[PDB]
Amino acid sequence: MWPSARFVDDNVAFSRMPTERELDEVAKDFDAVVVLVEEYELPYSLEEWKKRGVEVLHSPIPDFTAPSLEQLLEILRWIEARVREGKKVLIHCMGGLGRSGTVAVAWLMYSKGLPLREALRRVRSLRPGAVETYEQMEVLKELEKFLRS
């Protein structure tokens, strides 16, 4: 396996951004990637995934910002669809902590129904520093309120 990835369940992992040298490595282990980095901060084209048969969701979140609740729901629904297909999914931004950790926390709440406080603790046990900003925490609170409705 690609040990930079940390799995929050059997199918979904989060990590820092794979370099071009790591693409075949990640493609061996994952069938889909959620790319949270802006295109202009990529060192290769996302066509690199397509030539390897890996499905791509490109839903960028600017550095040090939170996704909207609607953006987070779109990403969650897409991860669920790949997982239902039996695929393994890698979530990544650049650093592997803030934006990717937020989506990882959201996935646990969304898929397992975990409360925010436990999902947060889980992901930070995996990667200390995950979910970096107040806005990232706040969209996770909004997601929780959404889900409990």
d(CA 20, CA 26): 10
Decide if 99 is inside a domain: yes
Q: Which of 8, 57, 93, 130 is catalytic?
A: 93
Q: Which domain holds residue 36?
A: 6-148
Q: What are the φ and ψ backbone dihedral angles of 90, each rounded to 5 degrees? A: -110, 125
1 within domain boundaries: no
Nearest Cα to 65, choosing from 128, 137, 14, 136?
Answer: 136
- β 89-92/55-58 pair status: unpaired
Query: Which approach determined this entry?
Result: X-ray
Answer yes or no: is 58 within a domain: yes
Q: Exposed, middle or buried by CB within 10 Å (0-12, 13-18, 19+), for 58?
A: middle
Resolution (A): 1.9
Domain count for the chain, please give it. 1
5, 15 Cβ separation under 8 angstroms:
yes
Q: Which two tokens stand for residue 26?
A: 């990640």
93 is catalytic: yes
Residues 6+ apart with CB under 8 A from 129: 97, 98, 101
Q: What is the DSSP letter of 99?
A: H
d(CA 119, CA 142): 14
